Amino acid sequence: VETFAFQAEIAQLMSLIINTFYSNKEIFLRELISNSSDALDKIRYESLTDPSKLDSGKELHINLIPNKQDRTLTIVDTGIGMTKADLINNLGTIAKSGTKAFMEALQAGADISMIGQFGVGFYSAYLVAEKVTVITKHNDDEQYAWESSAGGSFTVRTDTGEPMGRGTKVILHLKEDQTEYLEERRIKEIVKKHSQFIGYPITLFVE
Amino acid sequence: VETFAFQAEIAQLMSLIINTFYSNKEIFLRELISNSSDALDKIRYESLTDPSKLDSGKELHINLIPNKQDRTLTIVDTGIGMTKADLINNLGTIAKSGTKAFMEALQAGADISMIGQFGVGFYSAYLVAEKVTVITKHNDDEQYAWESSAGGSFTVRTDTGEPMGRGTKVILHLKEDQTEYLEERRIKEIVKKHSQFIGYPITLFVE
Ligand SMILES: CCN(CC)C(=O)c1ccc(O)c(OC)c1
Numbered sequence: 552v553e554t555f556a557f558q559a560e561i562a563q564l565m566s567l568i569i570n571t572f573y574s575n576k577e578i579f580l581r582e583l584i585s586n587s588s589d590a591l592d593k594i595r596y597e598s599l600t601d602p603s604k605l606d607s608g609k610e611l612h613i614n615l616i617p618n619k620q621d622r623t624l625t626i627v628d629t630g631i632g633m634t635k636a637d638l639i640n641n642l643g644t645i646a647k648s649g650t651k652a653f654m655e656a657l658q659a660g661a662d663i664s665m666i667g668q669f670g671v672g673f674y675s676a677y678l679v680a681e682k683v684t685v686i687t688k689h690n691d692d693e694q695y696a697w698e699s700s701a702g703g704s705f706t707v708r709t710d711t712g713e714p715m716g717r718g719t720k721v722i723l724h725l726k727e728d729q730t731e732y733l734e735e736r737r738i739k740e741i742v743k744k745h746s747q748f749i750g751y752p753i754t755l756f757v758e
Numbered sequence: 759v760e761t762f763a764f765q766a767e768i769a770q771l772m773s774l775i776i777n778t779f780y781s782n783k784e785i786f787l788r789e790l791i792s793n794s795s796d797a798l799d800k801i802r803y804e805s806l807t808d809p810s811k812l813d814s815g816k817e818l819h820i821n822l823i824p825n826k827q828d829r830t831l832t833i834v835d836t837g838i839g840m841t842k843a844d845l846i847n848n849l850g851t852i853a854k855s856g857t858k859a860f861m862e863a864l865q866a867g868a869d870i871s872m873i874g875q876f877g878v879g880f881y882s883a884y885l886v887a888e889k890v891t892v893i894t895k896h897n898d899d900e901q902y903a904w905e906s907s908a909g910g911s912f913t914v915r916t917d918t919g920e921p922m923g924r925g926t927k928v929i930l931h932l933k934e935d936q937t938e939y940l941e942e943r944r945i946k947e948i949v950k951k952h953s954q955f956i957g958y959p960i961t962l963f964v965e
């Protein structure tokens with residue numbers, strides 16, 4: 552298990568997300584679904600000139616898996632996935648510069664819901680989750696598990712768990728007062744409201 | 759000079775853009791600026807683990823260059839640029855699937871301004887231009903010039919013109935009745951309206 556420190560600006564972004572009074576929390580799902588869409592676009596583009604890219608899995612889609620027992624909402628995609636380097640480098644984002652722009656925007660009247668426009672939408676997972684676990688598999692690497700409960704550090708380990716084939720799995724360990732996001736009609740409402748133009752199937756699992 | 763046929767679905771997207779009565783043409787600039795932002799994000803991300811990626815040019819920005827003599831509006835960025843393969847493969851887009859989703863959306867009430875959400879925003883250049891020339895330079899290839907006046911075909915040639923260092927240059931040969939997009943206050947208005955959260959400098963050249 553390797554423990555790393557977040558870059559200062561990312562710890563601050565996470566602190567802002569966690570600490571700010573801000574009711575419109577539901578947007579975390581749209582931001583995660585959108586990152587999944589972007590990863591799927593990437594593998595699909597690569598497959599256009601190299602069909603073998605899809606050897607690790609031909610279907611391009613997203614599953615939403617609520618689990619009330621464990622209190623987790625899981626967002627799985629079969630997109631391009633991430634290498635160990637992508638994971639350590641702020642999950643494939645340009646987070647330092649994105650955080651800088653987001654902060655300026657907030658100072659000038661933007662609100663937290665606009666986070667995705669600064670390319671750090673992943674971190675909005677902290678609006679609802681106390682701990683976030685990311686399992687990922689890229690064609691060019693082995694499966695890894697990234698994890699953080701914020702607090703300025705994250706871990707990375709080689710994942711021994713069930714093999715994924717290819718893609719990214721975001722496991723949200725939901726805060727005690729955010730269990731509405733495990734409820735079927737609430738998830739369906741949010742998907743329909745914010746993710747109506749996502750070009751891949753989104754399957755909501757039932758329990 | 760190599761001449762290629764557009765895939766059928768792209769020729770149809772272009773025909774739709776060109777033929778539909780649709781007044782809100784100004785959005786082409788926001789879509790091009792946004793593609794440039796995405797290319798810049800890409801090179802910046804690569805530079806995070808490999809500083810030499812920026813050997814071909816350290817500054818990450820966008821220039822807007824109107825030229826009333828030639829009737830061209832040029833959008834230059836110093837982003838990641840495109841290889842010959844990217845160019846032939848619909849300028850690095852997943853255009854067939856993106857066109858499919860855009861068409862469905864239009865049929866269900868979307869309008870042309872939402873084109874960028876389907877990842878084929880580049881083609882909105884045809885709302886204002888009769889011919890579009892794209893000059894591009896990727897670290898992994900030499901400089902190329904892609905060109906199309908629609909009509910179902912595009913060309914690709916190795917570019918002999920002034921060397922770019924790295925990035926993408928979109929030269930819009932504007933339609934005779936679209937010269938307002940060469941006017942300073944009109945360009946400035948559009949940038950301010952639609953591109954206020956682009957995290958790179960956008961320099962509007964004067965003539
Ligand atoms: C670098 C590839 N990538 C992003 C396009 C993913 O696999 C990915 C998918 C979903 C996410 O929520 C995510 O969080 C950042 C990353």
Ligand SMILES: CCN(CC)C(=O)c1ccc(O)c(OC)c1
Pocket residue numbers: 790793794796797835837838839840844848849850851880925926928
């Ligand atoms: C594949 C890299 N890329 C797109 C991210 C560009 O260089 C690029 C930049 C501006 C554009 O208008 C464009 O048109 C599609 C492409």
